[PDB]
Structures are given as structure tokens and as C-alpha cells.
PDB file of C-alpha atoms and ligand atoms in Angstrom:
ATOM      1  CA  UNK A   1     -34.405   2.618   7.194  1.00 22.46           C
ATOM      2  CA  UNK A   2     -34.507   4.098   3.760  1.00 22.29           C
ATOM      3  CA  UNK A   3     -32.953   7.690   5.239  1.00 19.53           C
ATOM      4  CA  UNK A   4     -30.379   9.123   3.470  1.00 19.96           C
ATOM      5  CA  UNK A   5     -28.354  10.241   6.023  1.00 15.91           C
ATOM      6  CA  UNK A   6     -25.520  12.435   3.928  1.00 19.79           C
ATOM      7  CA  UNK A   7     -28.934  14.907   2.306  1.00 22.75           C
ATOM      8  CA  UNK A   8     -30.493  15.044   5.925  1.00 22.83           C
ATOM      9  CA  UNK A   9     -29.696  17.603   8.868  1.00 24.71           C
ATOM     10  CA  UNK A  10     -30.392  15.864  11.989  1.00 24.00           C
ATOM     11  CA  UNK A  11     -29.149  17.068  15.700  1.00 27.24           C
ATOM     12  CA  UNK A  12     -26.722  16.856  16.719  1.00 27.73           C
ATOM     13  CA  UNK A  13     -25.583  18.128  13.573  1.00 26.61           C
ATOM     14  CA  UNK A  14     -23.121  16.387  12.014  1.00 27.33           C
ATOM     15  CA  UNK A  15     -19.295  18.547  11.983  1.00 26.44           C
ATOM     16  CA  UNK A  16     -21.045  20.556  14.826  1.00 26.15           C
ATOM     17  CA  UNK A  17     -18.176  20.953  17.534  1.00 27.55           C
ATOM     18  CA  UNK A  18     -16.546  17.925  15.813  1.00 26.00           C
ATOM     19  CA  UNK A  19     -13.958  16.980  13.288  1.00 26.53           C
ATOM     20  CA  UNK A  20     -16.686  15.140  10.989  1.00 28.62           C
ATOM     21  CA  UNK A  21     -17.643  16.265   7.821  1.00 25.88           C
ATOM     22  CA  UNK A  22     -20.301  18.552   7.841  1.00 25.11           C
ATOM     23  CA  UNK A  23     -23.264  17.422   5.452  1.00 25.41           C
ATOM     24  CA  UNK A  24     -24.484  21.450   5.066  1.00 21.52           C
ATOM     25  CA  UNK A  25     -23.201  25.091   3.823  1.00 22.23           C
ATOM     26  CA  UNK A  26     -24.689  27.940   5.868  1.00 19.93           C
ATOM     27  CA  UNK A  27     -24.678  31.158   3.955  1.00 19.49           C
ATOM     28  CA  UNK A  28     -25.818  34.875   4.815  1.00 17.18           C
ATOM     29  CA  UNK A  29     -27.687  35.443   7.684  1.00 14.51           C
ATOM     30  CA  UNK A  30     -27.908  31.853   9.143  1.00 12.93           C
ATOM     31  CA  UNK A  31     -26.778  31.200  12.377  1.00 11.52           C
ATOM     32  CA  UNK A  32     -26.255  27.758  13.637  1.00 10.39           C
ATOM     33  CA  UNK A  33     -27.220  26.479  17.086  1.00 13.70           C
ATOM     34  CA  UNK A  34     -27.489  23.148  18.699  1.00 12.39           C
ATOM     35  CA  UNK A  35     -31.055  23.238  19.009  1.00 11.10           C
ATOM     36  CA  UNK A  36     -32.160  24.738  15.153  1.00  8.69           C
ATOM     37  CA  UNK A  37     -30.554  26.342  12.123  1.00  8.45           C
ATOM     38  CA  UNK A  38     -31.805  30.089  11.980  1.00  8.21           C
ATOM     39  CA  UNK A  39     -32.427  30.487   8.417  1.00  8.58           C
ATOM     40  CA  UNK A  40     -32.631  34.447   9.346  1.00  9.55           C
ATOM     41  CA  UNK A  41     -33.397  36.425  12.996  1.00 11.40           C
ATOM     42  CA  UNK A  42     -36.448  38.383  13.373  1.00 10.76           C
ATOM     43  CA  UNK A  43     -34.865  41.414  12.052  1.00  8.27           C
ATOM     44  CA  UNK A  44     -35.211  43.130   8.887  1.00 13.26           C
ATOM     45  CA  UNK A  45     -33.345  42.631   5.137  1.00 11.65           C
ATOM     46  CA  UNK A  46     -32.077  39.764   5.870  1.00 10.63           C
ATOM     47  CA  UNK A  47     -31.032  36.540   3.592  1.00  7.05           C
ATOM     48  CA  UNK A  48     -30.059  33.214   4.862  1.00  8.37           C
ATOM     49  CA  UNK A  49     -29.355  29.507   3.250  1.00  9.93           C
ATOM     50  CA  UNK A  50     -28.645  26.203   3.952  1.00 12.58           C
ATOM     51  CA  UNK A  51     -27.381  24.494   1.462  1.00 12.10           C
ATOM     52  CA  UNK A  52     -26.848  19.937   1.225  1.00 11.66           C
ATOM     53  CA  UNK A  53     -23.139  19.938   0.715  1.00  9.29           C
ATOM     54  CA  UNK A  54     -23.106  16.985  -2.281  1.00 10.77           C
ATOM     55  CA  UNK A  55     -25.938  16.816  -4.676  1.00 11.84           C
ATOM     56  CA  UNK A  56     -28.701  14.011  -4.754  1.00  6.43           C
ATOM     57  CA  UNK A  57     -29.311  11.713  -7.015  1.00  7.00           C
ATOM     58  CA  UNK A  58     -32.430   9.725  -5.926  1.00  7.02           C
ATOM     59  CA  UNK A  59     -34.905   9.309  -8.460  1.00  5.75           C
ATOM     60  CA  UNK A  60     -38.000   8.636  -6.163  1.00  7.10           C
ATOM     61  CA  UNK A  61     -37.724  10.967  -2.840  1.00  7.38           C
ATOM     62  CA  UNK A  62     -39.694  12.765   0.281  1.00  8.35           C
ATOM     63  CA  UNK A  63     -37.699  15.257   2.036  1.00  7.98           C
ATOM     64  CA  UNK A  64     -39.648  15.695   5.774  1.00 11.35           C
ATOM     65  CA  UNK A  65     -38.793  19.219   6.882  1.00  9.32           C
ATOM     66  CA  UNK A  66     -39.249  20.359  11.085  1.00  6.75           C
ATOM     67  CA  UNK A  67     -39.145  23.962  10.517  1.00  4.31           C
ATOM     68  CA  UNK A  68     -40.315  26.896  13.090  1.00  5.75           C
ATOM     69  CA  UNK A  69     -41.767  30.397  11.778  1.00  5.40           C
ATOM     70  CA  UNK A  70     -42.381  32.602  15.049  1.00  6.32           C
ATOM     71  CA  UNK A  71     -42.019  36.499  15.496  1.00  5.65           C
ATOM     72  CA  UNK A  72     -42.794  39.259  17.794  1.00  4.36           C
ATOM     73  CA  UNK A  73     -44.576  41.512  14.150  1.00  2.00           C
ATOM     74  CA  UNK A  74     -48.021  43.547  15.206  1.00  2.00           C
ATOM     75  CA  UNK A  75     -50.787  42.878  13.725  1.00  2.00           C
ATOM     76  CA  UNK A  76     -50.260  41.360  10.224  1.00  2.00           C
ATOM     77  CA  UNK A  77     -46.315  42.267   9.797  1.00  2.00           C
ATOM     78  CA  UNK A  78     -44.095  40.107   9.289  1.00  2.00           C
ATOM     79  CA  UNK A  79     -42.349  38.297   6.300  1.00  2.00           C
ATOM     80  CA  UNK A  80     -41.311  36.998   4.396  1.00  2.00           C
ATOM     81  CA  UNK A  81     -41.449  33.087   4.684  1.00  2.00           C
ATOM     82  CA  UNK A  82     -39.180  30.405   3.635  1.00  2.00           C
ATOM     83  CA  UNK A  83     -38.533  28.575   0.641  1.00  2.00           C
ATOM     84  CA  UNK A  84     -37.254  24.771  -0.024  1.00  2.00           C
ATOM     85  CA  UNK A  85     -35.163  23.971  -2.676  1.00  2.00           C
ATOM     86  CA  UNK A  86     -34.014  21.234  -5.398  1.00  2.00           C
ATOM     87  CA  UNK A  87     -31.793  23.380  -7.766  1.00  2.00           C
ATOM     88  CA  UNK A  88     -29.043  23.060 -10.215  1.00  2.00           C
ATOM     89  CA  UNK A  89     -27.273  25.729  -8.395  1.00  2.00           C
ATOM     90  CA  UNK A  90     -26.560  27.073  -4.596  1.00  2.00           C
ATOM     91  CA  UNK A  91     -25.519  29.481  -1.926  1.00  2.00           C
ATOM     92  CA  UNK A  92     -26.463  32.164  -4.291  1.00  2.00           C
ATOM     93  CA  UNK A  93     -28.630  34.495  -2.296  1.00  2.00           C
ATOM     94  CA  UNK A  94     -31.189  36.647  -3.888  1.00  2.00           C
ATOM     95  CA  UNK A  95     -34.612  38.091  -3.539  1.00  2.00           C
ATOM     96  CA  UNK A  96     -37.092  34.415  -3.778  1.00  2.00           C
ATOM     97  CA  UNK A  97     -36.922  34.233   0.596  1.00  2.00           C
ATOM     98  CA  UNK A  98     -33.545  34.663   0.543  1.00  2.00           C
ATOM     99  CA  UNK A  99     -32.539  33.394  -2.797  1.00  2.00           C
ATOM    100  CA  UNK A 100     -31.559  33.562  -6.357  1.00  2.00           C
ATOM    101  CA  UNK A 101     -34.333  34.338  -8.967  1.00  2.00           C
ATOM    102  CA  UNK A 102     -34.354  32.775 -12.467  1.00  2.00           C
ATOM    103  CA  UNK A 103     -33.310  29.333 -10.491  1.00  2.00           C
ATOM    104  CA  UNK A 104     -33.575  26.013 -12.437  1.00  2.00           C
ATOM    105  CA  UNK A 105     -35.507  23.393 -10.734  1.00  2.00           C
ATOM    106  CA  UNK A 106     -38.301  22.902  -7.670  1.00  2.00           C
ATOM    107  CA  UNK A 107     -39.104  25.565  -5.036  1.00  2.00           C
ATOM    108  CA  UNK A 108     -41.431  24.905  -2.564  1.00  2.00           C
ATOM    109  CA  UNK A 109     -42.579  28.332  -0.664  1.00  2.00           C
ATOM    110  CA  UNK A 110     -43.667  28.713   2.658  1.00  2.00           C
ATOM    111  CA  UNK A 111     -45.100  32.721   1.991  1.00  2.00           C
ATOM    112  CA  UNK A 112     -46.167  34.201   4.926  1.00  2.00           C
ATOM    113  CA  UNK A 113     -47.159  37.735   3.720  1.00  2.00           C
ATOM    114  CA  UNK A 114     -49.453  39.259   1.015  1.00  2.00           C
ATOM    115  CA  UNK A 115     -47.528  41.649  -1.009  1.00  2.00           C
ATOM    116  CA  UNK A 116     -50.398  41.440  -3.338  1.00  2.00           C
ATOM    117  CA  UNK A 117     -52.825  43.761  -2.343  1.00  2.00           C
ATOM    118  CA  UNK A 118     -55.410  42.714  -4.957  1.00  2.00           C
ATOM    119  CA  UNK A 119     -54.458  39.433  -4.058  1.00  2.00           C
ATOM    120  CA  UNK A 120     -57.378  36.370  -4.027  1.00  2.00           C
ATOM    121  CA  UNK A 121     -55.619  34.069  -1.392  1.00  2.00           C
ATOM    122  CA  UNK A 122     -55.375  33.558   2.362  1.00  2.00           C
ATOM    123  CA  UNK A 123     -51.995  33.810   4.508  1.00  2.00           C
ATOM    124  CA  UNK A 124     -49.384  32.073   4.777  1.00  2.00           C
ATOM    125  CA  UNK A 125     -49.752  29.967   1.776  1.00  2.00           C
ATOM    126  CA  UNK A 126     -47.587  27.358   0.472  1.00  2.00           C
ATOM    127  CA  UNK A 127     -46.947  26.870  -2.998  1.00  2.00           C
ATOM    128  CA  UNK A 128     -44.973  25.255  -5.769  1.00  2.00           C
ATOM    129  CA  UNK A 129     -42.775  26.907  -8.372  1.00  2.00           C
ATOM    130  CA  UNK A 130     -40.685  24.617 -11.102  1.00  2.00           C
ATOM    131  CA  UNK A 131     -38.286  26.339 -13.435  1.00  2.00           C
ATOM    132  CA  UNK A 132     -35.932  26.636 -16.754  1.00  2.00           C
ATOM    133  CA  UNK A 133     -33.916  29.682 -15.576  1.00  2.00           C
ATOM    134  CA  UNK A 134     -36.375  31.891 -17.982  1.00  2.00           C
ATOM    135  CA  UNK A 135     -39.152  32.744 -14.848  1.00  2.00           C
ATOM    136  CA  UNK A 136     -39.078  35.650 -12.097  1.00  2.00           C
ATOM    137  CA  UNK A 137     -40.856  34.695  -9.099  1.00  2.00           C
ATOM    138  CA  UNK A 138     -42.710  37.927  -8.420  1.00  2.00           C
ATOM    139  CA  UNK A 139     -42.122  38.804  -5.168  1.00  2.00           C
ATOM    140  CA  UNK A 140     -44.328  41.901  -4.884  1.00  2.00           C
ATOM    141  CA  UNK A 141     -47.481  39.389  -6.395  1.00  2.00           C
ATOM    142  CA  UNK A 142     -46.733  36.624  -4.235  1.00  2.00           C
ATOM    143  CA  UNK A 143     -45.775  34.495  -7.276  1.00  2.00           C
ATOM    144  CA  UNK A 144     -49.015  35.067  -8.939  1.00  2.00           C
ATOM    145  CA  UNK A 145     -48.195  34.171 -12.061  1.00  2.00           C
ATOM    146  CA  UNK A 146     -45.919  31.114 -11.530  1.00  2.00           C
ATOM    147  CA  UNK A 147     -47.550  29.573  -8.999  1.00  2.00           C
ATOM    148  CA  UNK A 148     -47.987  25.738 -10.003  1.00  2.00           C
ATOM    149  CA  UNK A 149     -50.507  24.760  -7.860  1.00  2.00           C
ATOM    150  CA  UNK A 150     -51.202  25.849  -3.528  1.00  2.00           C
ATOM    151  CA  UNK A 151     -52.692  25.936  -0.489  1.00  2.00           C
ATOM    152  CA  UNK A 152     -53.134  28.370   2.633  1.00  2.00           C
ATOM    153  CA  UNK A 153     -51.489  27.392   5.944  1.00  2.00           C
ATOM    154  CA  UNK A 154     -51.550  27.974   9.290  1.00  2.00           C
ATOM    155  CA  UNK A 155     -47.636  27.378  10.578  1.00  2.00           C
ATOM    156  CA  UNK A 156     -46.590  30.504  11.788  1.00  2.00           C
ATOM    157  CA  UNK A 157     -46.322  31.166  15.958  1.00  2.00           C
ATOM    158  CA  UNK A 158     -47.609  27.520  16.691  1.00  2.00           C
ATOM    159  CA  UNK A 159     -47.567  26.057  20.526  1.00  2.44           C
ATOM    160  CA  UNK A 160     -46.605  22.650  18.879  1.00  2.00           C
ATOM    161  CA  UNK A 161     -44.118  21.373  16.234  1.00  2.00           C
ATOM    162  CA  UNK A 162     -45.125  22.182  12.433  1.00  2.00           C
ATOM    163  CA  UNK A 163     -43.616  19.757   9.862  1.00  2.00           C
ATOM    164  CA  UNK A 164     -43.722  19.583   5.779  1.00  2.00           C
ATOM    165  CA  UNK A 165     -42.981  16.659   3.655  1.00  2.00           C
ATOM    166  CA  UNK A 166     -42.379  16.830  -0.098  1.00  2.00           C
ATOM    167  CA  UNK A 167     -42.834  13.794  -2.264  1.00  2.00           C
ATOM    168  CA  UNK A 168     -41.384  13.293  -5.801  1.00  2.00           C
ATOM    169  CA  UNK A 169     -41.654  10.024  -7.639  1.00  2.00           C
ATOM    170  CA  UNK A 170     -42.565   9.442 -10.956  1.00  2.00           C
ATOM    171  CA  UNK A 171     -43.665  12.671 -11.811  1.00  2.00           C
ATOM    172  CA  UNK A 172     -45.698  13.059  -8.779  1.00  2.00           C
ATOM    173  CA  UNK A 173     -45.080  16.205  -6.982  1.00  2.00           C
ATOM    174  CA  UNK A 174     -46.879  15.823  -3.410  1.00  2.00           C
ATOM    175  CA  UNK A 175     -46.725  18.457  -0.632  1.00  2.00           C
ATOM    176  CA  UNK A 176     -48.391  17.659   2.564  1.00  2.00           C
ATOM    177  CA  UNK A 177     -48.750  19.755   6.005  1.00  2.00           C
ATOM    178  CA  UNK A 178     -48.717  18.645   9.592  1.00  2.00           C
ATOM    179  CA  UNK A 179     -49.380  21.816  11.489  1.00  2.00           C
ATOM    180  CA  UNK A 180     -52.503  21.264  13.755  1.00  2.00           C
ATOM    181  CA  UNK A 181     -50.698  18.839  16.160  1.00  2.00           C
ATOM    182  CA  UNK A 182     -52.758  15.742  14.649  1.00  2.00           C
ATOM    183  CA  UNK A 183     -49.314  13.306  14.041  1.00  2.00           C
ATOM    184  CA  UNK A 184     -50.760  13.256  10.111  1.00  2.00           C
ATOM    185  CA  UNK A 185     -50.030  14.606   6.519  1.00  2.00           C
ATOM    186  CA  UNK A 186     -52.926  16.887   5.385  1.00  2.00           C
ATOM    187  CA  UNK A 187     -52.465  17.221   1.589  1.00  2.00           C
ATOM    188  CA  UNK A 188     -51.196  20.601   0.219  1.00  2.00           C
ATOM    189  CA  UNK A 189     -50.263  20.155  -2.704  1.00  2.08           C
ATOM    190  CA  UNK A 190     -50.954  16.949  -5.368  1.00  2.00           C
ATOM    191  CA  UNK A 191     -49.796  17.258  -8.979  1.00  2.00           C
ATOM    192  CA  UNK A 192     -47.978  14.942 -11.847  1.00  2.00           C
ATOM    193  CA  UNK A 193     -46.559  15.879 -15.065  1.00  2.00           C
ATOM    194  CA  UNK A 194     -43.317  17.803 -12.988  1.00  2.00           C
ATOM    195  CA  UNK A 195     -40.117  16.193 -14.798  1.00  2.00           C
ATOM    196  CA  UNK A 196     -37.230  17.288 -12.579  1.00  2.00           C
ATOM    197  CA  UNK A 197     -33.069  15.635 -13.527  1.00  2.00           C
ATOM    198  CA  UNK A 198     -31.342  13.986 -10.745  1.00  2.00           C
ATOM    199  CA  UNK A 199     -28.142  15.779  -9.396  1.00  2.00           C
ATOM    200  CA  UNK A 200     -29.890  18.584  -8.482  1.00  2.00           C
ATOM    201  CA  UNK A 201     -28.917  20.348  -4.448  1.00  2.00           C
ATOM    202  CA  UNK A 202     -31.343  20.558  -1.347  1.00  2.00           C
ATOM    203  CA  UNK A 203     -31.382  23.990   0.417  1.00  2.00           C
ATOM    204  CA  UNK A 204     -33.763  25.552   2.323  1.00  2.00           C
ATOM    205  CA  UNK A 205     -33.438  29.926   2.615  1.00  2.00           C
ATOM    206  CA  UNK A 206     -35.499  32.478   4.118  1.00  2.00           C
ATOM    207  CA  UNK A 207     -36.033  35.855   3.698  1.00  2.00           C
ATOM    208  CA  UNK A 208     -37.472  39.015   5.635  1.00  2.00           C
ATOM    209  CA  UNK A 209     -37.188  43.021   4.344  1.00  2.00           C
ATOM    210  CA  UNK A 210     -39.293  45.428   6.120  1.00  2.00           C
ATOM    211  CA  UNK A 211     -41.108  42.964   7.770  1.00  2.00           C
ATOM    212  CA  UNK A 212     -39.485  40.270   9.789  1.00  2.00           C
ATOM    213  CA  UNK A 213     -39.670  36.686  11.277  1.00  2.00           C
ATOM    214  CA  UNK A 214     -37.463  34.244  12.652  1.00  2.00           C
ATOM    215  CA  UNK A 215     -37.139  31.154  10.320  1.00  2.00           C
ATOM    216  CA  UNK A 216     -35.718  28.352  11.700  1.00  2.00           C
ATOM    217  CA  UNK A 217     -34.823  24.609  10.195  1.00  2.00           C
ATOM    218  CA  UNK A 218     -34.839  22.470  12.839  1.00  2.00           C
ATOM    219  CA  UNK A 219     -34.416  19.254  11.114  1.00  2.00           C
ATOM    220  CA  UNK A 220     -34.368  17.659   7.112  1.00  2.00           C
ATOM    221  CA  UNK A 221     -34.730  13.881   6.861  1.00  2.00           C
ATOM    222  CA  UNK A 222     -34.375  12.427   3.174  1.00  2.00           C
ATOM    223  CA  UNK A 223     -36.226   9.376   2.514  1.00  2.00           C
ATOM    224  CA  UNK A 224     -35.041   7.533  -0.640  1.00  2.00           C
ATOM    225  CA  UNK A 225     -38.617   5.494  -2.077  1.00  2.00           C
ATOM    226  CA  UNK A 226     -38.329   1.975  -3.314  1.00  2.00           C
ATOM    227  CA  UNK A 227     -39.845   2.671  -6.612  1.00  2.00           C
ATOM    228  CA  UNK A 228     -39.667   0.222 -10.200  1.00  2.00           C
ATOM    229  CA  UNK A 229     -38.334   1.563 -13.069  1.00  2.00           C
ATOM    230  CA  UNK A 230     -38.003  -0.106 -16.587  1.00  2.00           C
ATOM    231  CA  UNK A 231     -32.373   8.069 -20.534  1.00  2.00           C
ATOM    232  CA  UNK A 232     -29.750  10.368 -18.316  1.00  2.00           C
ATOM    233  CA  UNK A 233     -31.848  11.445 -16.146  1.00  2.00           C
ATOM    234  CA  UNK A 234     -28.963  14.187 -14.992  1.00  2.00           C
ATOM    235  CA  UNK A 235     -30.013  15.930 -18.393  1.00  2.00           C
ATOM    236  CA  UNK A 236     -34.056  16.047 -18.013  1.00  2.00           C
ATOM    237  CA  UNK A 237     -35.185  19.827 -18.392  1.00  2.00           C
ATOM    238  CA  UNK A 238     -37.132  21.132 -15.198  1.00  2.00           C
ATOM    239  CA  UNK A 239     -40.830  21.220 -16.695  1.00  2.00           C
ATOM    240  CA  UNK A 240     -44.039  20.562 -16.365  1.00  2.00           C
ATOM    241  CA  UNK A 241     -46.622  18.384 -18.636  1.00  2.00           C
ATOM    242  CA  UNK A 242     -50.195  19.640 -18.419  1.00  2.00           C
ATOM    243  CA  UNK A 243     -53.094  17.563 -18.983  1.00  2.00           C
ATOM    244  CA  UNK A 244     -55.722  19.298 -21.699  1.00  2.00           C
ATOM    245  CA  UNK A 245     -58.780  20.700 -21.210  1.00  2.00           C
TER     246      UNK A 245
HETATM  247 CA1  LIG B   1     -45.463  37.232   0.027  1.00  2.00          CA
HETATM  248 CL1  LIG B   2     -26.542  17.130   9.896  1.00  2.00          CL
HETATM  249 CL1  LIG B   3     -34.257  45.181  12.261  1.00  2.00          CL
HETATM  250 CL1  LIG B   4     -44.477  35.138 -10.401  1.00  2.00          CL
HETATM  251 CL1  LIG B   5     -50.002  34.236  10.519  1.00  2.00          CL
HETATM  252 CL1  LIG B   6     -51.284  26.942  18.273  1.00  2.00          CL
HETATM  253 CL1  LIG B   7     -51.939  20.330   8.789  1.00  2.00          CL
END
């Protein structure tokens, strides 16, 4: 296998009624039980985090994520969605589903609500967000105006297991969805030009304020790629490099 066992959470979870060392922080409102890691309970203003304990330093990566958004909301309410993370920092809770704002690196959200009411997309929608400390995600906009690149998504309430992978290699930023019990990666997301330094933490929050959801983790399994190369990479700037008109 090329799993990397120490930036994975896998059941039984490892320092889970044991003395071994546990791989994962949980912060705010996650609780931790042997069958998933609630990221938050379906009750409202709540902010939850898991957080990789060490951080990674694979070049060429896909993080698979088993994850579970499900909730009792009427109608159209409930929030606000999870987000995935590759940051310089941790733990630090925050508005973005549950954490900091003005983070430096990758997020990956999984947004289940419009806040935007002149917004132009469908819910939930899953987009990408890479950043220098400098942007806001706007919250109340859905991200509107740092949004990389998208797609909607139907993952929420599900009567079969919903799954995400992320993919970075070479500047290749990939996000693919398997959420319509087909065993297969539909592609989300497909963009290049993303630099991104190694040493960087995995963490996965969620988030819910007047509206609520559960958000559960059930499982992260890193994959390290067997990719050429031919620079500290620990120093490369989170950016991105556009191709022109
Ligand atoms: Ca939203
Ligand atoms: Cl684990
Ligand atoms: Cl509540
Ligand atoms: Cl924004
Ligand atoms: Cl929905
Ligand atoms: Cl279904
Ligand atoms: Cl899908």
C-alpha cells in the first residue's frame, strides 16, 4: 500500500480506549465515538475540528475522506457544511465551518446552505479556496469572491455512504465526488497552477449557527503518489498561477 497510516483516521481509531498514540486532536464541539468523529451535533452555534497530530510532508497526495452530513432541518434549514483542510496552522476555531479565517493554505468546502440570497449556484456545493493569510472567506456570500473553482453536490441525508477524494500533485488540484452509490469518482473539481509548501496540517471542521446539521468524519485515508521529480519546498507561498486569456 502507499497509505500513510500516521495522516489517516481509520476505526478503530488509533489511542481510542488504548495506550497508543493517538494520530488526531479533537477540538470544540467534536465528540468522538467508535463508529464516526462528530465534527459538530445537529444543534446550533457550534464549532468542531479534527486536527492530524504531526504535519505532512508528501509532495504528491490524495486524501479519501468517508464523511456523513444528515439532519432533522425543515425544509431548506440547515448549515452550515464542512470544510477540509491543509494549513500552516490548527485547532484554531473560527467562523470558515468551524474555523479560523485569514488561514494560509488549501480549504476544500463542503457548503450546504445559501447565505447568498442573490446567489447564482445550486446547494450544497463544494468548492476550493487557497490562501496567503490576506483573504476572508465570506461566509454570508458563500465564498463568492474567493471561490477557486466548484461544483454543486448532492451529499447531504444519503441512504448510502458519500465519499470525497482530493488529489494534489504537481500543481494539480483534483476534487472528485462519490455520492450516488456508483463505487466511482465523478470529477468536482480539476485545476493546475495551485503551488502549496509541504509541512502543512490535515484537519477537517464543521460548522452550524442558526441552522444545524450533524457532520460527521467517519474515516481519512492518505495516499502518498509515486510521482518523478527532477527548492525547499517547506517555504513555497500558497498561490495560484492562472493561465491568460
Ligand atoms: Ca453557505
Ligand atoms: Cl486513527
Ligand atoms: Cl440547538
Ligand atoms: Cl469570499
Ligand atoms: Cl440538501
Ligand atoms: Cl439517497
Ligand atoms: Cl458523485
Amino acid at each position: 500500500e502507499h497509505l500513510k497510516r500516521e495522516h489517516s483516521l481509520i476505526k478503530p481509531y488509533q489511542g481510542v480506549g488504548s495506550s497508543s498514540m493517538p494520530l488526531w486532536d479533537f477540538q470544540g464541539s467534536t465528540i468522538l465515538t467508535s463508529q464516526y468523529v462528530r465534527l459538530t451535533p445537529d444543534e446550533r452555534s457550534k464549532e468542531g475540528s479534527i486536527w492530524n497530530h504531526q504535519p505532512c510532508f508528501l509532495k504528491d497526495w490524495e486524501m479519501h475522506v468517508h464523511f456523513k452530513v444528515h439532519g432533522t432541518g425543515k425544509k431548506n434549514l440547515h448549515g452550515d457544511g464542512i470544510a477540509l483542510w491543509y494549513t500552516r496552522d490548527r485547532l484554531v476555531p473560527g467562523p470558515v465551518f468551524g474555523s479560523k479565517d485569514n488561514f494560509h493554505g488549501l480549504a476544500i468546502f463542503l457548503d450546504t446552505y445559501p447565505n447568498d440570497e442573490t446567489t447564482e449556484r445550486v446547494f450544497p456545493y463544494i468548492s476550493v479556496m487557497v490562501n496567503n493569510g490576506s483573504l476572508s472567506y465570506d461566509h454570508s456570500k458563500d465564498g463568492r469572491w474567493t471561490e477557486l473553482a466548484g461544483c454543486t453536490a448532492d451529499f447531504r441525508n444519503r441512504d448510502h455512504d458519500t465519499f470525497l477524494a482530493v488529489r494534489y500533485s504537481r500543481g494539480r488540484l483534483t476534487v472528485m465526488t462519490d455520492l450516488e452509490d456508483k463505487n466511482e469518482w465523478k470529477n468536482c473539481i480539476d485545476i493546475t497552477g495551485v503551488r502549496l509548501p509541504t509541512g502543512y496540517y490535515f484537519g477537517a471542521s464543521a460548522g452550524t449557527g442558526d441552522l444545524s446539521d450533524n457532520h460527521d468524519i467517519i474515516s481519512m485515508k492518505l495516499f502518498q503518489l509515486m510521482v518523478e521529480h527532477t527548492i525547499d519546498w517547506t517555504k513555497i507561498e500558497p498561490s495560484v498561477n492562472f493561465l491568460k486569456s
